[PDB]
Amino acid sequence: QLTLGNSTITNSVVAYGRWPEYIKDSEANPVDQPTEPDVAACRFYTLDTVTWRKESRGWWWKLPDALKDMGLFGQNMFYHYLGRAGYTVHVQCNASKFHQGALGVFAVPEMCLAGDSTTHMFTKYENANPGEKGGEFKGSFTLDTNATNPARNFCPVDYLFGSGVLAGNAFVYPHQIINLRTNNCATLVLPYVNSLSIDSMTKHNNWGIAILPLAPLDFATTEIPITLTIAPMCCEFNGLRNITVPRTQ
Amino acid sequence: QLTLGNSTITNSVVAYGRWPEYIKDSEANPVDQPTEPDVAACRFYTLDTVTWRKESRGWWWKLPDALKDMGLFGQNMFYHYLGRAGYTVHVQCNASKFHQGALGVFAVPEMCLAGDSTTHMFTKYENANPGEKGGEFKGSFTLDTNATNPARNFCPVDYLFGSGVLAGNAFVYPHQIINLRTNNCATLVLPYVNSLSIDSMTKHNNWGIAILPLAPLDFATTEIPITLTIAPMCCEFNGLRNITVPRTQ
Amino acid sequence: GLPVLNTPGSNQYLTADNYQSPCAIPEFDVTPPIDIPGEVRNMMELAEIDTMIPLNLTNQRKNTMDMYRVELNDAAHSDTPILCFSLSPASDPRLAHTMLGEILNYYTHWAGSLKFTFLFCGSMMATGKLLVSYAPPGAEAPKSRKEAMLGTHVIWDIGLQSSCTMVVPWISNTTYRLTINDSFTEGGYISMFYQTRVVVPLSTPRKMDILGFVSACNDFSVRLLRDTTHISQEA
Amino acid sequence: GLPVLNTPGSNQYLTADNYQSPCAIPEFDVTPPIDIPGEVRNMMELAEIDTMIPLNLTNQ
Amino acid sequence: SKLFSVWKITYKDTVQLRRKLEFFTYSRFDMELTFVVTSNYTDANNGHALNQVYQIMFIPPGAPIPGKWNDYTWQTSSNPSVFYTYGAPPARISVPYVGIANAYSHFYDGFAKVPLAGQASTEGDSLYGAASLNDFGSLAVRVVNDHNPT
Amino acid sequence: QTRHVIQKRTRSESTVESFFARGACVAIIEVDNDAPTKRASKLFSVWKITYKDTVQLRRKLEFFTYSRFDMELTFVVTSNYTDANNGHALNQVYQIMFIPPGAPIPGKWNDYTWQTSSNPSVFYTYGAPPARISVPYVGIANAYSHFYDGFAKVPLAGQASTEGDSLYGAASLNDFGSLAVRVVNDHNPTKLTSKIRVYMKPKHVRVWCPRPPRAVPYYGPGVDYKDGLAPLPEKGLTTY
Ligand SMILES: CCCCCCCCCCCCC/C=C/[C@H](O)[C@H](N)CO
Ligand SMILES: CCCCCCCCCCCCC/C=C/[C@H](O)[C@H](N)CO
């Protein structure tokens, strides 16, 4: 039973064996007094549930992007120039003893994804930051040929792990396997990982979450939901001003 | 209340935190016994008063040039090959509580001023050493096109601080602001600054005084006087001979 | 002779090298130093000196003394800014040519807090309150006092003190900002607004000037010496 | 000067050499490190991590 | 003929070192740069040349980029420059860790700008994964010699 | 409100030593190895030693009023053929003779003065690494003067206009002599042209009385200005 703030959840991987922690005085770059909302923002938020089908190729989210509209955490994120947080990611996917299938849940620091165009690094901010809905991996690469109105979106291929690396090696990242015959949940504890003590949450996504079907879902007859519950941890915010309002769509 | 010799004056800046001092035996280049007139020359002399108007661009003086005709100090200066002195500069400018305006008073070591001609370094001695009357800054640069009888004078532009540097940076020099709403006087204590322990006073001006209107004078209806009172300090003179009589006009 | 092996880099001239070389004037009796006033050990000493900001770079004011003066008047209160500029001390045109900007333009990286002092040059009879705000970057630059007041700010009573100093503390994602206009290392926004309004009695100037000054705090430092764009030579 | 004799190998550039060289940016105040998670000291650490085998390399 | 060339400093123009580095997300190291200089004649009917000297000037971000092979910028009063004599062993310099962050970022999952509501499409647009965390300046290379007949 | 930060940043690279710890080009001296009778080739060149022929080092130095430092001079020598139809040349040797004030200036590329019995001379072989020498602080004053607000002469009453006239700001405080450069080789059948680039590095630097930096283009050895008097660009008062 894992409790954070007013939220409780009732196999577990600490990424790099490093629990999330606050900035030490010896590593603090900004000088203003940080904001530490603690329980009001450091709590489990449940994202919109996705559906695992036989044909599903995979799903991806970005943190803190996926939580940008999650109550007071989102408010603090958009009201501050600088933000820092670890996470507890809880992937929930239950099925019967007569179902089969396996999911690889990977937490990837700096999870950059390949674009969909011959123009390099052309994925626009709106598509790179979908929010809680996240995005999906594709079976193959489809180059976007629309010159007038380019989609300017990611085209993350599953077996290339969306970034031109073999998916089988994605286990080098902190990960957990949800094997339907063994377990129905995965818990990943992610410390704040970055080349800086603190950064802009709106500009920069510190973590990516990739869920790939390692073994396709099957049932003797089928679709089962997957639910992500993410709690930001050891939140710190700096640089209070008027609220940021990112452009959307 | 600042008293020197027989003179008394009734906010204060010591340039470079160094009070004027006599030459130490370990820094004395000349070997003859120095002349130290003390009070007879180390006293406040009041220069001719200038008028601050709405259109005034600024004023400048050179030390010891401005004091060359100031009684016994001037006599000792012109009777000796070598002279050394610090200064106490007291700028006096009073107005009503209903006046507004601000003066920047800058003491500049080696205050070289730009010429008025395409010929480099062509300002003649008479114009470079105007005496107590000093000179004025100009709003813009006017090249002197008279080839037969060139003016051979300075053309010090105010926003270029008369020497091709932005006036806003002149605060790196020892300075004081006379803000009419706050104060009516500025006192600058200048030590003898030079690359030598002692030098020729007639050849070389150790200090320049530049008074610029940082905020133009204004009054609801206007002109107000500015009076400079300068006391040479820690005077030393060496190399007595017949009196120097510089060429004038 | 002693067996030696010349490595890569031999015979090069690196302008930043620090090697010994023969003296062309051996046994020269150097003139000893004297205790000249105002010795400088570090360029940051110059950067810590307040110098006047050319805040008003309009067409009719730039490259004149007027560019240093920002005009306040006694009109009715508004929330519109008196002045606005970005916290890019090396590349923002108002700050680039200050002494701090000049020093920073010889370096690639800068970090530390800044001091912005403002001097009110109106009459002694003028009263008023102003708001001076620093907004860290990432949001829309404050269009009005309502937004600006959400960031760091100071209320300045011109009647009480003719001068107000606001410290812009070092807040940055990176440990150093570049000395160029750069989105990733953007430093935020500085704005000034009327808090109440400038009030004058009769027979008093209804328009006056304020002056801006900027300097570096004691925590300021720079890195990666480089040539500046502020001086060039033709032909 | 000190008598020296240049041996074979002088003036070569061996890409695997380990020699000193002059610093192009002397007195640079290096940004200090922070305790980033997941530091790697040896490539074998990566080799000791289980990764999925592409066992089925059929045409389809 | 390009009398001078400006190359933005990066490890991404080639692949081998890039792949090795990108085995990892973050790195922190000093750098050793070795410059191997080769030259050749382009024709045989215009005489010969005297040994060339090359200037390799490091232009950190913000310093003026040369516009001509002999403009003022080559005075290099503050830019580090290496003058290499042709036929000498390859030039070599070292640099410490110069990242403005606490480590170099091989992957940056973000943008330099966040577009804001009410801004036009052209405004707030920056390349995905592009940050000044890897803005290390450039190298400007010229031949100091005045030209030969060939 | 502020937090506790254990600051680690130092000002090592902004010390006056570090700020000037670079070789800066102060002169490009052109010489020719050619037959003496061509009358267009300069077989020797005399350059008065100064930092004011270029601007970058000049501006950096003129951040301050007074300076005191030793100097490192590095000479980078480049050469080239001027035509292709007169054969080739053997490796050139260059003489760079320091002529202190008062020593006889050479009048011909091969006159007696090049014996350099008392003048320091550096003989540089072409293709060798750039020549380098060091000099201590040689000012006749206790510091070098970047700005001298005075004259070398004071005109006296009764003297004609021509007498007592000296340039404003010109003093022998910066009279450091000259460098005379020649190619020691006798000429080849083909003309060769060489340039010696002089790079100056102040060392053990001390400076006094900081000044605002030069803001408009330099015009002459003094502080005069004629052109480029509008360095500030246009920017709205309320434009971020
Ligand atoms: C004499 C001037 C030329 C020598 C100076 C060269 C300047 C080098 C300074 C830039 C430092 C680049 C360091 C490497 C950059 C790579 O992109 C990152 N390390 C990637 O991890
Ligand atoms: C072998 C002979 C050539 C090498 C000797 C070169 C002679 C150099 C002696 C003159 C010293 C000049 C020092 C620098 C002059 C500058 O104008 C001042 N330092 C300005 O502050």
Residue numbers in the entry:
A (entry chain B), B (entry chain B): 84 to 93, 99 to 309, 313 to 340
C (entry chain C): 1 to 235
D (entry chain C): 1 to 60
E (entry chain A): 102 to 251
F (entry chain A): 62 to 301
Would you copy out the relevant sentences from the publication that reported this structure?
Mature PV virions are ~30 nm diameter icosahedral capsids comprising 60 copies of VP1-VP420. ECs have potential as virus-like particle (VLP) vaccines to replace the current PV vaccines; however, recombinantly expressed wt ECs are inherently unstable and readily convert to an expanded form.
As yields of PV2-SC6b were lower than those of PV1-SC6b or PV3-SC8 we investigated shaker flask expression of an alternative stabilised PV2, termed PV2-SC5a27,42. PV2-SC5a was highly stable, with ~75% D Ag remaining at 50 °C and ~40% D Ag at 55 °C, outperforming both PV2-SC6b and BRP. Detailed structural analyses and comparison of the PV2-SC6b and PV2-SC5a VLPs from bioreactor production were performed by single particle cryo-EM. Data processing yielded a final set of 113,853 particles for PV2-SC6b and 147,409 particles for PV2-SC5a, and icosahedral reconstructions of 2.4 Å and 2.1 Å resolution, respectively. The structures confirm that both PV2 VLPs adopt a homogeneous D Ag conformation, with negligible or no particles observed in C Ag form. The quality of the cryo-EM electron potential maps is sufficient to resolve the stabilising mutations and confirm that they introduce no significant perturbations to the structure and do not impinge on the antigenic surface of the particle. Based on the extent of the observed electron potential map in the VP1 pockets of both PV2-SC6b and PV2-SC5a, a sphingosine lipid moiety of carbon length 18 was modelled into the maps. For PV2-SC6b the mutation in subunit VP4 I57V (I57V in VP0) and for PV2-SC5a the mutation in subunit VP1 T41I, were in disordered regions of the map and were not modelled. However, in the presence of adjuvant, the response to PV2-SC5a VLPs equalled the neutralising antibody titres elicited by IPV to 0.25 of a human dose, as observed previously for PV1-SC6b and PV3-SC8. Therefore, these data suggest that in the presence of a licensed adjuvant, PV2-SC5a VLPs are at least as immunogenic as IPV per D Ag.
